[PDB]
Amino acid sequence: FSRQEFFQQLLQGCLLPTAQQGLDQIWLLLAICLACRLLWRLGLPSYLKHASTVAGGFFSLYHFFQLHMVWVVLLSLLCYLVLFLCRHSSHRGVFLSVTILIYLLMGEMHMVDTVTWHKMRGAQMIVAMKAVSLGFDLDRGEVGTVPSPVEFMGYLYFVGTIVFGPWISFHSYLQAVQGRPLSCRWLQKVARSLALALLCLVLSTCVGPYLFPYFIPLNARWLRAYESAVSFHFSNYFVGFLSEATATLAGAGFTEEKDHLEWDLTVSKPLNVELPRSMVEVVTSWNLPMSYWLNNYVFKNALRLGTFSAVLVTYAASALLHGFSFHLAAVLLSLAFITYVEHVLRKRLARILSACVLSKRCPPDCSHQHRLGLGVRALNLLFGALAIFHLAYLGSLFDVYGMAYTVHKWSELSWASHWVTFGCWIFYRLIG
Amino acid sequence: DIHMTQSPASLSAFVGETVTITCRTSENIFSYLAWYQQKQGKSPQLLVYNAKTLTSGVPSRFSGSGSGTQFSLKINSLQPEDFGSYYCQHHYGSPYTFGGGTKLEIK
Amino acid sequence: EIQLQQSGAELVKPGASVKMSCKVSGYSFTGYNMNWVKQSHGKSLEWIGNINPYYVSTNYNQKFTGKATFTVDRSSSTAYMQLDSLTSEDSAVYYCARSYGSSHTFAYWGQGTLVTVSS
Ligand SMILES: Cc1cc(-c2ncc(CC(=O)Nc3ccc(-c4cnccn4)cn3)cc2C)ccn1
Ligand SMILES: CC(C)CCC[C@@H](C)[C@H]1CC[C@H]2[C@@H]3CC=C4C[C@@H](O)CC[C@]4(C)[C@H]3CC[C@]12C
Ligand SMILES: CC(C)CCC[C@@H](C)[C@H]1CC[C@H]2[C@@H]3CC=C4C[C@@H](O)CC[C@]4(C)[C@H]3CC[C@]12C
Ligand SMILES: CC(C)CCC[C@@H](C)[C@H]1CC[C@H]2[C@@H]3CC=C4C[C@@H](O)CC[C@]4(C)[C@H]3CC[C@]12C
Ligand SMILES: CC(C)CCC[C@@H](C)[C@H]1CC[C@H]2[C@@H]3CC=C4C[C@@H](O)CC[C@]4(C)[C@H]3CC[C@]12C
Ligand SMILES: CC(C)CCC[C@@H](C)[C@H]1CC[C@H]2[C@@H]3CC=C4C[C@@H](O)CC[C@]4(C)[C@H]3CC[C@]12C
Ligand SMILES: CC(C)CCC[C@@H](C)[C@H]1CC[C@H]2[C@@H]3CC=C4C[C@@H](O)CC[C@]4(C)[C@H]3CC[C@]12C
Ligand SMILES: CC(C)CCC[C@@H](C)[C@H]1CC[C@H]2[C@@H]3CC=C4C[C@@H](O)CC[C@]4(C)[C@H]3CC[C@]12C
Ligand SMILES: CC(C)CCC[C@@H](C)[C@H]1CC[C@H]2[C@@H]3CC=C4C[C@@H](O)CC[C@]4(C)[C@H]3CC[C@]12C
Ligand SMILES: CC(C)CCC[C@@H](C)[C@H]1CC[C@H]2[C@@H]3CC=C4C[C@@H](O)CC[C@]4(C)[C@H]3CC[C@]12C
Ligand SMILES: [Zn+2]
Numbered sequence A: 001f002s003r004q005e006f007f008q009q010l011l012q013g014c015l016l017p018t019a020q021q022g023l024d025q026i027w028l029l030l031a032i033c034l035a036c037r038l039l040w041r042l043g044l045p046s047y048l049k050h051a052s053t054v055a056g057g058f059f060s061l062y063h064f065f066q067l068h069m070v071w072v073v074l075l076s077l078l079c080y081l082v083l084f085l086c087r088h089s090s091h092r093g094v095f096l097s098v099t100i101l102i103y104l105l106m107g108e109m110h111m112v113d114t115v116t117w118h119k120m121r122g123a124q125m126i127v128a129m130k131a132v133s134l135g136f137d138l139d140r141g142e143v144g145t146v147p148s149p150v151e152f153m154g155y156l157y158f159v160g161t162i163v164f165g166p167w168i169s170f171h172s173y174l175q176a177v178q179g180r181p182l183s184c185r186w187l188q189k190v191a192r193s194l195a196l197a198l199l200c201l202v203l204s205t206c207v208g209p210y211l212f213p214y215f216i217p218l219n220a221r222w223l224r225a226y227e228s229a230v231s232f233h234f235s236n237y238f239v240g241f242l243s244e245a246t247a248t249l250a251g252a253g254f255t256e257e258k259d260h261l262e263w264d265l266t267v268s269k270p271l272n273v274e275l276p277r278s279m280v281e282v283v284t285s286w287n288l289p290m291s292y293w294l295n296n297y298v299f300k301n302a303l304r305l306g307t308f309s310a311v312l313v314t315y316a317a318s319a320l321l322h323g324f325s326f327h328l329a330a331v332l333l334s335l336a337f338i339t340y341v342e343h344v345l346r347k348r349l350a351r352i353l354s355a356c357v358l359s360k361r362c363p364p365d366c367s368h369q370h371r372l373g374l375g376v377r378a379l380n381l382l383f384g385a386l387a388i389f390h391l392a393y394l395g396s397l398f399d400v401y402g403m404a405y406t407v408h409k410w411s412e413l414s415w416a417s418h419w420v421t422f423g424c425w426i427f428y429r430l431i432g
Numbered sequence B: 001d002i003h004m005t006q007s008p009a010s011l012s013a014f015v016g017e018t019v020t021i022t023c024r025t026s027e028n029i030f031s032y033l034a035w036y037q038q039k040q041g042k043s044p045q046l047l048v049y050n051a052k053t054l055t056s057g058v059p060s061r062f063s064g065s066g067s068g069t070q071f072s073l074k075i076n077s078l079q080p081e082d083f084g085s086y087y088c089q090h091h092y093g094s095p096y097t098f099g100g101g102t103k104l105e106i107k
Numbered sequence C: 001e002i003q004l005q006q007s008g009a010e011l012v013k014p015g016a017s018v019k020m021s022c023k024v025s026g027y028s029f030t031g032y033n034m035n036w037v038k039q040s041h042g043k044s045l046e047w048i049g050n051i052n053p054y055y056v057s058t059n060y061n062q063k064f065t066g067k068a069t070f071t072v073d074r075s076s077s078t079a080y081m082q083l084d085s086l087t088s089e090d091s092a093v094y095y096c097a098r099s100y101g102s103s104h105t106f107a108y109w110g111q112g113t114l115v116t117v118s119s
Helices: A003-039 A046-064 A070-085 A092-108 A114-137 A149-156 A170-177 A184-205 A211-215 A222-249 A279-284 A288-305 A307-321 A326-353 A374-398 A403-411 A416-430
Strands: A255-257 A260-262 B004-007 B010-012 B018-025 B034-038 B045-049 B062-066 B071-076 B085-089 B102-105 C003-006 C010-012 C022-025 C034-039 C045-051 C058-060 C068-073 C078-083 C092-099 C106-109 C113-117
Touching (some): A003 A046, A003 A184, A003 A211, A003 A222, A046 A070, A046 A149, A046 A170, A070 A092, A070 A114, A070 A149, A092 A307, A114 A149, A114 A170, A114 A288, A114 A307, A149 A170, A184 A222, A211 A222, A279 A288, A279 A326, A279 A374, A288 A307, A307 A326, A326 A374, A326 A403, A326 A416, A374 A403, A374 A416, B004 B085, B018 B085, B018 B102, B045 B062, B045 C106, B071 B085, C003 C092, C034 C068, C034 C078, C045 C068, C058 C068, C078 C092
Parallel strands (some): B010 B102
Antiparallel strands (some): A255 A260, B018 B071, B034 B085, B062 B071, B085 B102, C003 C022, C022 C078, C034 C045, C034 C092, C045 C058, C092 C106, C092 C113
């Protein structure tokens, strides 16, 4: 049906039902988060606050996942065991990481109920990303005492970051248990993040998939790829801004410097991906808490294996946390080559031309000659175009399916990115 | 950085009295705080950790208590070998900062 | 019995570098962190930093970064600290201290090296 007949029913078929479902899904999680935020302001003993958030986490998990929340609860218990047995050693990170690895593998063998296991990962993952975190923050000395059972449980089951919420370090949660005054910036941040989450949801559901035929007079295999990539990006940004809102509602996600308290828990920066500078900025700004967790607790450890062999292990860990699907695993493996080759090639180009063409906008104290020349703008724009093209290629797998689906979807595109990356690596090794 | 103040900077009591040293923390540490004792010319020794738990091999007269931003060590029935500097040191997270140091002296 | 032997006193010219050594004996060296602490004369203690002997990642105090570097030797179980560009403000005693394990309190202390900077 034509554009007019589409827009005549757009609002009644897309704008109201999508937002209705988006609000019906979270009207209870937001209520529980607000109840926790208000309850943690009565000057209660800390153990009672941790017990309250444990109860809230149980109730929230039960409300989302009917009774399969055991596959999370169990994990939590298991984690604490591996934290209490090796509490004295300096291997806490390694033991907790091996436990998480064994648990996720034993889960991905598709023995236990998979219809609901494959939809709890978004929560289960977080728990893992928390436990391992502590296991290393105690080793390097960034956390003093091994927490008591109630503190650890109230950390894993933090009602703000249990369902969608991002990973937050143990100290960034302890400083939330103390609680901060209900300022106006707090409500402002919560409302802004909720509005942006709803906007990204309604913009991903059916303004994305119907982008180029109707919203554009253009219309193929590349246009569908780009619209699928945009739909996927915004379907993520929904969860991102919603997690940011639920974590700023429960009290967490705030920095303080020179008695200045600011709520700036950023999870996803959409303007660094839709108008990208480089694929490194796309990856590290697709999910900021996870992009910091992986760089700090996986890459920095496996760095002994060599730079590339550590980047690849980091992407393997990221493809294991998200849940192993062949399209997602292929994307998160190709991203390793793409990002590494682009980074090192831009590095060589900047060292040769003495220009500011690094994969990140340099600091003001760089030793480059061409800081703002038109050639620098042209190179940055060409690499941004390559980044948009890599995104439109990779995100084509997430339309709305094992090796056959991926091979077919990438054969319709004639393997454009996997040849552009090879060409860029050849170009890098030739001008070496 | 967490600023730890400690009071008093220097006191003096007879043998067999009861003394209370206080450590006030700028930020809020939940219960993470340790008390070390250092005699004249020797390395310190851990006396109390978690602000109440006594270490292995310390007499039962050292009784530390408190929580939040106000902790206190209580030395009752003072003994001759209990004279020296006492440092409070939080262990809530790096970087750990020590207190000023109360110097218990003879009287 | 746990014993953290330490090097002897050092007298260094201003601007030079020094390298201490804390030899551990009494437990598995790669089991617990090793903190380095500095104490002036008649002053309070200051936490220089720590090193994890299992994986050699370190953790410095921001006031002592770039001035003290930590290294380890697992074969002889010895923890070294190197101070660079010493001034007259670094004449103090330096202790090594094994973390308690569960908590990060300094359970077993060394004996300290007196580092004096003069001409
Ligand atoms: C098709 C598609 C997919 C994505 C996408 N991007 C990112 C993630 C999460 C993720 O893995 N982050 C991450 C961050 C840092 C590092 C890292 C740090 N240091 C060294 C080496 N590596 C590795 N990984 C997930 C998806 C689906 C984005 C856009 N288009
Ligand atoms: C063009 C990009 C940059 C912004 C998109 C703005 C969209 C919302 C605007 C710009 C062009 C507009 C379209 C222009 C032409 C018509 C034909 C008319 O019979 C029905 C409305 C319709 C279909 C408009 C719908 C709304 C519209 C698509
Ligand atoms: C979510 C936002 C940012 C992107 C979508 C823009 C929406 C809100 C705008 C752009 C095009 C607009 C539509 C354009 C055409 C018509 C037909 C008219 O008879 C009723 C209003 C209606 C149905 C508009 C409703 C609002 C509308 C759909
Ligand atoms: C989220 C909404 C719908 C329910 C919660 C409403 C109440 C309990 C919350 C929401 C916004 C909050 C207010 C926003 C900021 C201020 C200004 C400050 O100088 C006094 C506290 C005060 C007035 C807060 C008190 C608590 C508050 C009023
Ligand atoms: C699951 C998807 C992402 C594939 C992941 C492949 C990863 C996990 C595999 C394939 C190639 C493997 C690497 C091959 C070569 C090296 C160099 C060697 O000195 C240490 C092992 C190391 C570093 C391996 C680590 C694990 C490794 C990187
Ligand atoms: C993709 C799924 C299976 C998880 C990712 C696999 C990772 C975690 C596994 C597969 C290959 C493994 C590596 C194989 C080789 C070695 C060299 C050894 O001296 C240290 C352990 C180390 C470095 C392993 C670390 C963990 C490792 C990298
Ligand atoms: C990153 C991961 C998920 C994809 C890359 C892993 C590659 C090396 C593995 C995973 C799946 C494997 C394929 C699975 C199915 C078959 C069909 C069989 O008759 C020939 C081998 C073949 C073709 C395998 C080749 C190697 C293979 C493609
Ligand atoms: C390695 C990086 C650059 C690409 C990541 C995707 C790779 C691992 C996947 C995607 C498509 C897959 C290929 C699809 C088709 C076949 C033909 C078969 O007869 C051998 C395996 C082979 C060749 C697969 C090998 C693995 C493969 C190339
Ligand atoms: C600057 C960027 C955005 C445009 C130029 C870089 C890349 C994306 C360009 C350079 C060469 C181009 C390819 C040239 C040849 C073909 C074969 C055709 O049957 C499918 C399109 C395809 C595969 C093109 C895809 C896009 C492409 C790979
Ligand atoms: C520069 C190169 C090395 C990057 C990797 C290229 C690989 C991933 C691409 C290039 C050519 C592609 C092959 C082209 C032809 C077909 C025939 C089809 O029936 C199965 C997939 C298959 C077999 C493709 C598998 C993947 C493939 C081998
Ligand atoms: Zn520059």
